[PDB]
Structures are given as C-alpha cells and as structure tokens.
RNA sequence: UCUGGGUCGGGGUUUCGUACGUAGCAGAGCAGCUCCCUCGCUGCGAUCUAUUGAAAGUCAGCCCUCGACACAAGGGUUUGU
RNA sequence: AGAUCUUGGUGGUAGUAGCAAAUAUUCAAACGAGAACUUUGAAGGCCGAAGUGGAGAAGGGUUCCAUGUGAACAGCAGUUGA
C-alpha cells in the first residue's frame, strides 16, 4: 500500500477542485498465459463441463 | 564415583565451606579412595584438594 | 456503473514512494543523497578505491 | 576429507529473537548445537566449555548478537559408537564481525 | 629442565578456571 | 504537489505525513513524526539536537 | 536447469542519536613546580568541541545480492481399472 | 434385583483432569546397561546476617555415620535417598 495526491472533479462537493490524499493498493499483475479452453453446456441441473 | 563424603571431610579439615573446596576433576579415583580425614590431609598437602580463594568484594568503589 | 463516483476520470498528481519500513521521509535515493550529502561510508569509499 | 575444520560466525541474535528472558541463553546453545549439526551432519556435537562461557558471558537474557565459532569434525575412533564422527565446536575471540567470511582453516 | 613441550602442557595443568581464578600451585603424587 | 512544509527538525514534510499543531495564541506548527513533535512539546531547543537542520547549520 | 535453496558477508532501508580512543591555548577551578618565566608549565576536574548524522541494531515474518562457504538425484510408508 | 441395603471385586469417565505459589539454568567429564535430575569441574543466578547461614528447647527415636541393593517407596526419573 501507499498513498497518492490527486485533483478532485466532483462538483458541489467541498473537495471540488482541491487536492486530496487517498490510500491505494498496488497489485502486481504479470501477464497471464492461456493454456486451455473449457466448454459448458446448460442443463436443468446447472452448468456442467462439456 | 560419588565424592559427597570427600567434599564434606575436606571442608572440615580446611576449616572452610563446601563453596571453597576444590577437588581435582581429573584425579577423581585418587580422591575417592580417601575415606578418612588423615588421607584428606595428604591430598591437601599433595595439591589434589585446594581451598579456593574468597570471592572478591572490593571496597575501592566505596572508598 | 452510472453513479458520479464511478465513471469519474482519475488524474494522479503525486505518488508517494517514501520508505514504509519505518517513518520514511525521502522519495528517492537521489533526493536522500542530495539532502544529506556525503557520509562516512562514502568518504572512505573514495579513499579506499580512489 | 572428513577431518575438516572450518571457522563460522553465527547470528545468535537472529536465532534467539522471540525467546523469553529466562530461556535466551539456554536456547542459544540449543541453536548452536543445531547449527553445527547442519553444516557437519554429525548428530554428535560437543560444545567447548569456553564457548559455553562466551554465550553466558552477559547473563541469561543479554546473549551476544554474534559469535565466532570453529567447527571441527573429528573421528570418533575412541569407543564403539553409532556415530563415526563428532563435531567439536570451539570459541574464537574476535574484535569485530565486519567482513568475516566462513573460512576453511587448517590443522 | 623446562623445555617448550613441558611449558606448553604446563599452561593446561596450572589453569583450573577462567579469568580471576587462582592458579594451581602444585600437583604432587606420592604413595 | 501541494505546499511543502518544514518541521521542528527542519526536514521536508510530504503530503499525507506527520501532524499539524494549532496553539491557542494563533501559531501553527507542523511536525514530521512523533519524535520531532514530542521534542517540540517538551520545550526542547532544536539547535541542541544533532540531527536537526537548525543544529547542523549552526555548527 | 538455462542449477537450487541455505549460512555468513556486503549494499539498501530504517531506529536511536554523535561511540571507544586521541587531540584542544575549551572548561567552574583546585593542588604542585619559578636560577626559571616576563607571563609560564605539571597533575586532578564534571562538562564542551573536532574526529563523528558518528557508534550500534536491522528479519528472526524487511528489500537486492550473485562476494565467500558447505550442502543438495538422499531416506521411510503405501497406493491397480 | 432393589432397602441413598452390608462386605468384596470391577467398569465407563480416562490415558482424561491434572503433575503451573516463592526469577534459572548451561557446558564438559566420570561412574554406570541406562544420566534433564548422581558426582566433579567450569560458568550464570538466588537466599542477602529479621538467611534458603550457624546452634539449641519441645516433639521425634536411630531418621545420625560407613558399605552395599536397585524389588517396592521417594505422585517423572535416579547410578541418588530421611
Ligand atoms: Mg510502516
Ligand atoms: Mg545483512
Ligand atoms: Mg444382589
Ligand atoms: Mg422385589
Ligand atoms: Mg493432560
Ligand atoms: Mg503442569
Ligand atoms: Mg540477591
Ligand atoms: Mg537455622
Ligand atoms: Mg544420612
Ligand atoms: Mg517415581
């Protein structure tokens, strides 16, 4: 986690056109690799893996 | 084996406490053969039993 | 998402990068070195390595 | 060779962190004995009494942060034992632990 | 007479403790 | 990117850090952490603390 | 494995606050030494200053090492349409 | 078959509650089939002279002291022991 500073563009608010700080969470997201495909068929008992 | 008797006799002969009785850890068999105060005197003279000095309590700080 | 809180464009002005392993007070290594100047470890570093 | 001897430094502070006051020094010698079992593989580890004094030098809770020891793997050809080797760990007095590597030491 | 080897072992049999402890004065064997 | 403040220690205070003090006489101070704040609150002179900017410029 | 994970070491970060020793014509002063000196020198003396944002710790549940050292194709118990 | 029956024996509970008042142990060696507990040595600690020290009165009655044993006892163990 860390925090930022940003300009708010919310009209009618007190913090309009003002700087605020806000906690943020950094989530490292390296690219995913696709390795398969699953099909599903709708049945009167739910989805089942085709 | 067990030198409980010899430490007690050495304390009485040396006129000290068992705190101040030092029996040789290497000559355990020699000391174990001394079942009388006369042999304890011989071991003290030979140096197998030694009276340790009094723990230092200096008064240099107080002075 | 139809509310004004959503679909609101975010424009960051500053991202904090002080040390979170304590009360960090410098954003970058270069800013820390510029503020404090040379230290004893660097003074002997230039002495031993010329 | 299996009669090797090496000079290590052990971060006692690392291995004692979290132990209670009346158990820090006893745990330090359990961690030293467990340490020597790792780099030497011998379950028979003997700790020199001078090293025992060094650990207990500042009482039972203020154990030194670092200790410089010398592991000495020796032959157990003194009696019929399940272990053919034993490691005798000794004490090495040092003035500083800076830039102290694990060094092989001769006889 | 005292040589280097006898002096080396003498350091062992004269120290019966650590720092601040008394040095051993004698170890005589008689029968 | 806001106003950049300076502490009892004279260090730079970035937004979202420290606290601000508003005395009754109308003066406003700002501190970088509780170490710099509590030194100020104990009537301690910054020119006598070796890690303070005011000390380093005096010496 | 195009190695691995450890243990030390290093660097970073951070915590506290400027270490021991040495030096000073710094220092309330005091006690000695004056053919002496023409204003001097020898000790004791908290504290101060320079060395010195120094010293010390920092994963054990901090970050990066690819520096050094050793070790890692070993063990045991089971499992069949 | 009963009497909260008498005497004796045995279960479940249950390998459970528990073996938590008074700071604290550690290293090496010896003996020994066997050592966390015995002994010796080395450290680190406590009692801190209104003591966990040194001696008595009452009470106990051989617990005193040597040697040996390792059955039972010392609510773990013991090579130790009142
Ligand atoms: Mg934090
Ligand atoms: Mg490191
Ligand atoms: Mg009946
Ligand atoms: Mg009936
Ligand atoms: Mg239980
Ligand atoms: Mg219990
Ligand atoms: Mg006391
Ligand atoms: Mg009494
Ligand atoms: Mg008796
Ligand atoms: Mg029992």
Query: What is the 3 state secondary structure string of B23-59?
Result: ECCCCHHHHHCCCCHHHHHHHHHHCCEEECCCCCCCC
CA distance D47 to D87: 8
D91 three-state secondary structure = strand
CA distance C26 to C19: 7
In this structure, the number of other CB atoms found within 10 A of the CB of residue F52 comes to 21
Distance of CA E1 from the midpoint of ligand 3 (Å): 98
- The whole-number Å distance from B2's CA to H61's C1' is 30
Query: What is the 3 state secondary structure string of chain C?
Result: CCCCCCCCCCCEEEECCCCCCCCCCCCCHHHHHHHHCCCHHHHHHHHHHC
Ion ligand 1 neighbours, Cβ < 5 Å: C 20
C16: chain F residues, CB-CB within 8 Å? 14-16
Q: Rounded to the nearest 5 degrees, what angle is found at the Cα of D41, between the Cα atoms of D93 and D4?
A: 55
Closest-CA residue of A relative to F2 is A19
Resolution of the model in angstroms: 2.8
CA distance A5 to F4: 13
Q: Rounded to the nearest 5 degrees, what angle is found at the Cα of D45, between the Cα atoms of D44 and D51?
A: 165
Task: Evaluate whether chains D and A are touching (3 or more beta carbon pairs less than 8 Å apart).
Answer: no
Question: DSSP character for F24?
Answer: T
Q: Would the CB atoms of F14 and C23 count as touching at under 8 Å?
A: no
Element housing A3 (H / E): strand A2-7
The alpha-helical segments, DSSP class H, found in F1-59 are 34-41, 53-58
Q: Would the CB atoms of C16 and F14 count as touching at under 8 Å?
A: yes
Q: How many CA atoms within 13 Å lie on the side-chain side of F22?
A: 1
Packed helices B4-14 and B37-46: angle between N→C axes, nearest 10 degrees: 80
Give yes or no for a contact between D100 and D39, defined as CB atoms under 8 angstroms apart: no
CA torsion sign, B9 to B15 to B19 to B23?
negative
| Number of the ligand closest to the Cα of B4 | 9
C42: left (phi over 0), alpha (psi -120 to 50) or beta: alpha
Phi and psi torsions of A12, nearest 5°: 85, -5
Q: Rounded to the nearest 5 degrees, what angle is found at the Cα of F30, between the Cα atoms of F27 and F32?
A: 165
Nearest to B47 among E21, E22, E27 (CB): E27
Nearest to C4 among A2, A10, A19 (CB): A10
D49 three-state secondary structure = helix
Q: Give the residue among F19, F17, F20, F14 at the shortest CA–CA distance from F2.
A: F14
CA distance D36 to D87: 7
CA distance B23 to E27: 12
Q: How many CA atoms within 13 Å lie on the side-chain side of C38?
A: 8
CA torsion sign, E17 to E22 to E23 to E26?
negative
Bridge partners, residue C31, by sequence: none
CA distance E23 to C11: 81
User: What approach was used to elucidate this structure?
Assistant: cryo-EM
Q: Give the residue among F50, F51, F11 at the shortest CA–CA distance from F32.
A: F11
Closest-CA residue of C relative to F13 is C25
Element housing F21 (H / E): strand F19-22
Question: DSSP character for E17?
Answer: S
CA distance F57 to F59: 6
Distance (Å) of CA C5 to CA A8, A18, E4: 11, 16, 91
């Amino acid at each position: 986690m860390t925090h930022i500073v940003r300009e708010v563009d919310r009209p009618g608010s007190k913090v309009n056109k003002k700087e605020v700080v806000e906690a943020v969470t950094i989530v490292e997201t390296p690219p995913m690799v696709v390795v398969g495909i699953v099909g599903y068929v709708e049945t009167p008992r739910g989805l089942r893996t085709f | 084996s067990m030198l409980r008797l010899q430490k007690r006799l050495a304390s009485s002969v040396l006129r000290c406490g068992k705190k101040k009785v030092w029996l040789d850890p290497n000559e355990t068999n020699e000391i174990a053969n001394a079942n009388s105060r006369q042999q304890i005197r011989k071991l003290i003279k030979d140096g197998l039993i030694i009276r340790k000095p009094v723990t230092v309590h200096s008064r240099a700080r107080c002075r | 998402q139809t509310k004004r809180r959503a679909l609101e464009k975010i424009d960051l002005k500053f991202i904090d990068t002080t040390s979170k392993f304590g009360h960090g007070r410098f954003q970058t290594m270069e800013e820390k070195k510029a503020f404090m100047g040379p230290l004893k470890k660097d003074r002997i570093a230039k002495e031993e390595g010329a | 060779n299996e009669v090797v001897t090496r000079e290590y430094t052990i971060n006692i502070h690392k291995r004692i962190h979290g132990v209670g006051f009346k158990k820090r020094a006893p745990r330090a010698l359990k961690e030293i004995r467990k340490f020597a079992m790792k780099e030497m593989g011998t379950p028979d580890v003997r700790i020199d009494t001078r090293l025992n004094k060094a650990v207990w030098a500042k009482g039972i809770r203020n154990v030194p942060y670092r200790i410089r020891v010398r592991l000495s793997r020796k032959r157990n050809e003194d009696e019929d034992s399940p272990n053919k080797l034993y490691t005798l760990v000794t004490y090495v007095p040092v003035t500083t632990f800076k830039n102290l590597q694990t060094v092989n030491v001769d006889e | 007479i005292m040589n280097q080897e006898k002096l080396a072992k003498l350091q062992a049999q004269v120290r019966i403790g650590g720092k601040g402890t008394a040095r051993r004065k004698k170890k005589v064997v008689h029968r | 990117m806001k106003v950049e403040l300076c502490s009892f220690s004279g260090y730079k205070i970035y937004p979202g850090h420290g606290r601000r003090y508003a005395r009754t006489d109308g003066k406003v101070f700002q501190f970088l952490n509780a170490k710099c704040e509590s030194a100020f609150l104990s009537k301690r002179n910054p020119r006598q603390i070796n890690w303070t900017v005011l000390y380093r410029r005096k010496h």
